[PDB]
Design an enzyme around this catalytic site. Sequence first.
Site, PDB file in Angstrom:
ATOM      1  N   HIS A 189       0.792  -1.223   0.000  1.00  0.00           N
ATOM      2  CA  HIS A 189       0.000   0.000   0.000  1.00  0.00           C
ATOM      3  C   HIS A 189       0.828   1.278   0.000  1.00  0.00           C
ATOM      4  CE1 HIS A 189      -3.746  -2.227   1.246  1.00  0.00           C
ATOM      5  NE2 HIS A 189      -2.846  -3.031   1.782  1.00  0.00           N
ATOM      6  N   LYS A 208      -8.384  14.167   4.880  1.00  0.00           N
ATOM      7  CA  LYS A 208      -7.522  12.997   4.809  1.00  0.00           C
ATOM      8  C   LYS A 208      -6.432  13.268   5.837  1.00  0.00           C
ATOM      9  CE  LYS A 208      -5.907  13.564   0.596  1.00  0.00           C
ATOM     10  NZ  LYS A 208      -7.030  12.974  -0.190  1.00  0.00           N
ATOM     11  N   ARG A 209      -5.640  12.256   6.165  1.00  0.00           N
ATOM     12  CA  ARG A 209      -4.587  12.469   7.148  1.00  0.00           C
ATOM     13  C   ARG A 209      -3.638  13.576   6.713  1.00  0.00           C
ATOM     14  NH1 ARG A 209      -3.785   8.673  11.383  1.00  0.00           N
ATOM     15  NH2 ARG A 209      -1.963  10.015  11.768  1.00  0.00           N
ATOM     16  N   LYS A 220       0.515  14.455   0.732  1.00  0.00           N
ATOM     17  CA  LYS A 220      -0.867  14.722   0.346  1.00  0.00           C
ATOM     18  C   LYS A 220      -1.035  16.201  -0.009  1.00  0.00           C
ATOM     19  CE  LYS A 220      -2.798  10.961   3.164  1.00  0.00           C
ATOM     20  NZ  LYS A 220      -3.483  10.138   2.123  1.00  0.00           N
ATOM     21  N   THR A 253      -8.743   6.568  -1.372  1.00  0.00           N
ATOM     22  CA  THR A 253     -10.087   5.994  -1.377  1.00  0.00           C
ATOM     23  C   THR A 253     -11.082   7.097  -1.079  1.00  0.00           C
ATOM     24  OG1 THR A 253      -9.806   5.278   0.930  1.00  0.00           O
ATOM     25  CG2 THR A 253      -9.457   3.635  -0.809  1.00  0.00           C
ATOM     26  N   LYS A 273     -15.040   8.130  -2.606  1.00  0.00           N
ATOM     27  CA  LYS A 273     -16.202   8.499  -1.801  1.00  0.00           C
ATOM     28  C   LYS A 273     -16.824   9.794  -2.323  1.00  0.00           C
ATOM     29  CE  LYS A 273     -13.714   6.535   2.112  1.00  0.00           C
ATOM     30  NZ  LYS A 273     -13.111   6.925   3.366  1.00  0.00           N
TER      31      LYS A 273
HETATM   32  C1  LIG Z   1     -11.784   7.171   3.352  1.00  0.00           C
HETATM   33  C2  LIG Z   1     -11.032   7.698   4.601  1.00  0.00           C
HETATM   34  C3  LIG Z   1      -9.649   7.953   4.562  1.00  0.00           C
HETATM   35  C4  LIG Z   1      -8.799   7.818   3.285  1.00  0.00           C
HETATM   36  O1  LIG Z   1      -8.820   9.071   2.601  1.00  0.00           O
HETATM   37  P1  LIG Z   1      -7.757   9.412   1.454  1.00  0.00           P
HETATM   38  O2  LIG Z   1      -8.121  10.748   1.003  1.00  0.00           O
HETATM   39  O3  LIG Z   1      -7.689   8.293   0.487  1.00  0.00           O
HETATM   40  O4  LIG Z   1      -6.370   9.499   2.199  1.00  0.00           O
HETATM   41  C5  LIG Z   1      -9.035   8.471   5.657  1.00  0.00           C
HETATM   42  N1  LIG Z   1      -9.733   8.732   6.783  1.00  0.00           N
HETATM   43  C6  LIG Z   1     -11.067   8.474   6.864  1.00  0.00           C
HETATM   44  C7  LIG Z   1     -11.771   8.705   8.201  1.00  0.00           C
HETATM   45  C8  LIG Z   1     -11.735   7.962   5.775  1.00  0.00           C
HETATM   46  O5  LIG Z   1     -13.105   7.755   5.851  1.00  0.00           O
END
Ligand SMILES: *Cc1c(COP(=O)(O)O)cnc(C)c1O
Length: 810
Positions: free
Chosen positions: A351, A542-543, A548, A650, A654
Amino acid sequence: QISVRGLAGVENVTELKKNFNRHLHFTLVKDRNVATPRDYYFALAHTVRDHLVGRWIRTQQHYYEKDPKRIYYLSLEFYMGRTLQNTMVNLALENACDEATYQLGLDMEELEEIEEDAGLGNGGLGRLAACFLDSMATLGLAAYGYGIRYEFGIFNQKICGGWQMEEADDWLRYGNPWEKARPEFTLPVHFYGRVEHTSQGAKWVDTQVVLAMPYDTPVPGYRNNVVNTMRLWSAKAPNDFNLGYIQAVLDRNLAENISRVLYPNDNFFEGKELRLKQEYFVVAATLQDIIRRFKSSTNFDAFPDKVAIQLNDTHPSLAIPELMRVLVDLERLDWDKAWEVTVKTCAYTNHTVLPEALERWPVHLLETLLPRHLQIIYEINQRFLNRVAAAFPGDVDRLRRMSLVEEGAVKRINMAHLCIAGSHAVNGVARIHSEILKKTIFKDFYELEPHKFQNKTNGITPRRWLVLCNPGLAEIIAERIGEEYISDLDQLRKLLSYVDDEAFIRDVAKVKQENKLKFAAYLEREYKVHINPNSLFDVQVKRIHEYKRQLLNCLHVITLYNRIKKEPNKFVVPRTVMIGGKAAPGYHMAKMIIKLITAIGDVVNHDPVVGDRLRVIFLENYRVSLAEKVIPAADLSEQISTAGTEASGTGNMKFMLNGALTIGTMDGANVEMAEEAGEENFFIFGMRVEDVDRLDQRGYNAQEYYDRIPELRQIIEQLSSGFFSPKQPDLFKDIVNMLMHHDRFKVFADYEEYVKCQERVSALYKNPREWTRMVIRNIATSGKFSSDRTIAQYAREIWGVEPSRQRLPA
Ligand SMILES: *Cc1c(COP(=O)(O)O)cnc(C)c1O
C-alpha cells in the site's frame, strides 16, 4: 419515509417496540423516567443486534457443513466507524426502526449520533479493510477479518490555540454491544526465549507467555442473510504470571500493554519493540486459530485449498515465518513441503512506495524477541538468493539488492522482500501504483517472478458510502433505475441516459443543496461557526501528510485571499474551503501544517473586505463518522498528492460517488477515475509521474519558481514576515525553509497549474446546470470503484474462490 430504507411492516414495528422496551428494562435496568438518550441508543442497539444473531449462527453453521475455502484477511487496522445504522441498512431494518422509535417518541438520528466510532485504524488502510469485510460478506465469501482489539483507537483530535492536541480514544468506556467476547477460545502467544537444537528438530523454549483472548464482531452482508466474523485479539496475562505479591499483579500491565493502543502513524514506519510485539501477537494467535479450524474441516497438502491468507501490507508479514515455524517445528513437515504450502497460502498487498513507510526491522530486535523466526528468515533468504543466483549468474549486486537482509549501520530485515518471497501473489492498489512497483521498488522481484505481480484497484462499499451517508441521493437514483445498483454499482452507468433529463438534473442539485444545508447547520450545532451554504464547498479531508500536499491547498487559499484584497469589488465565486485530518503525534511538520491552516483562517475569516466570499475552516477530529457527514456535502474534492505518492487513495472514490467534482493530479486511483468518467469531466492538473522523474534527474530547485512567480513570492514573504502570525513573526520558518530548500514533494512545481485549474472550477460552478451535468457524468461512472468489484477480483484471481449473490434462508 424513503424507499431504499425498507418496509415499515405493522408486525415488525410492533415487535421492535416491545423488544426495545424489553431491553430498556431487563438489559439496561432503566425505566422511561430515568433513561437518558444513551440508554435509548443501547436499547435500540441491542434490539437490532438480536436480529443479527440468528443469521450469524446459521452462517457459521453453514460454513461448517459446506466447508468452503476460508479467506483470512490479516490487518493491524480495521477502521469500522459506527455499526448501528450500517447494521439496519444491511438487514433492511432502517424504516421499521425509524417508525418504531418514532412511535416511542424518539428521534433515531439523535440516537445514532450517540454511538462511538470504532476507530481501530489510522485512515485509508484501515478503512479499506472495513470496506473489504462488508464486500466479502455481501459476496458470500467465507471470510474472517483478524486484527487486534486496541483498548484505545486513533486519538480524538482537539484544536487548542490553533494547535492539535491529542486525547485518548476511550471507545470502550460505555461498553461495546457489537462484540462478543469468546474467552473459551483464548490462545497462548510466545515471546523471547531461545532456540534449542535437539536430535529431531529445533525447539523454542524459555519463552514468556501472553494469552490472546478473541472478541467477535458480526459483519452482515447486504440483504443476503450472511453474517461473517471479524475476530480481534486482546492481550491477557496468564495467572501464574510473575508469580512482592502486589507488584507481581500490577506488573501484569506489561504483558497486556500489547493490545493497549493503536500506533497513530499513517504511511510512516516507527520501529518500536511494542509495535513488533503487536505484529507478532496478531499473527501468532490468528495462525493457531486458522490451523485449529482447518484440522476440523494432517496432510496440509490441502491446506492451500482450504485456506487463503491475505496480508494487509507487511504489518502481519511474520505470518510467513510463523507458518513455517508451525509446519516445520510443530507438525514436522520437511522444509520444502512447508514452504510450498506457505507460498500457496499467502498473498501480499502493498500500500505504499514511500521509503519512510516501508518496514525494515533491526535484526537485534527479532534476535531477542523472536529468535526462532529470525533463524527461519535467514534460511528463507539463503534459499531465495540461491534461486536468484541461479537465474542471474554472476549478478552480485542483484543478490545484495534482493536480499531480505539489509547490511549497513545496523542489519535490518526488509519485510516487503520477505512477503514477496513467501507469497504466490503480490498486488498494488491502483493501476499506476502496481506499475510503479514493477518498474521501481520491486523491479528485481518482478524480473525473477513476473507471474506473482498483479493489480487490484481499491474500492469503497456503496452501502456505507452512499445508501447510509447519502440516502437522498440513493433515493433519487433508485427512483430511476431501481435498487439493484446497491450491490451492483456498475448499473449506475444507466444514469448517463438522464444527463439531459431536466427533472433529474434538478433533483441531483437539490440533494446536494440539502446536504450542504444540513452540514452547514451541524457546523454551528457542535462547533459554532457560521458558513454560507450558497458557496462552493471546497474540501480536503484525509490524514495530514507532506505528500498529500495540504500545503499546496494552503497556497491556493492565500492566493485567493490576496487577489480579493487587491481587487475587493471584483466578483469571485464564493468558497468555503474545508480542510481536516489528523497529524501523527510525532510528525512535527504535519502539526505545523495544521497550525498554518487555522492561522490562515484567523486572518481570512475576520477580514471585513472578504465578507462571506471566502471562509477557511479546519474540520476538527476528522474520522469515519465525520466523513459520512462532510463528503455528501462537498462540491469539490481535493486529491492533490504529488504524482507517484498516493498508492491509490479511497477518499477520492467516496467524493465521486456522492456528487462532488474532483480536482487532482494523475496519482493513484485518480487516473482510473478520470479514465472512467472522461478527462473532460475531471479537473486534472500538475506533473505526471514522468514529469516528477524528469525534475528529479535535473534537480528540483524551488527558488526558480519563487523567482518567476510574483504571486508565489508574495505568499512566501507573507509567511516569513509574520503576516499570518503577528505575535510570533517567525512561527512558520520551518515551513518556508522546507518549501524553499528541501521539499521532497515539489509543492511549488504544481502551483501555477493548480491555481489555473482552480479558476476553471470556479468558472464551471457559475453555471449550475452544467456543473450538475458533469456531476451526473461522474456519479454514473463511479461503479468500478465499488469494493464489491475489488473483492470479486481478489476472489477470482488470488484466492481462487467464486463470489455469490445468493441469499441464505433467514
Ligand atoms: C476514506 C477515509 C480515509 C482515506 O482518505 P484518502 O483521502 O484516500 O487518504 C481516511 N480517513 C477516513 C476517516 C476515511 O473515511
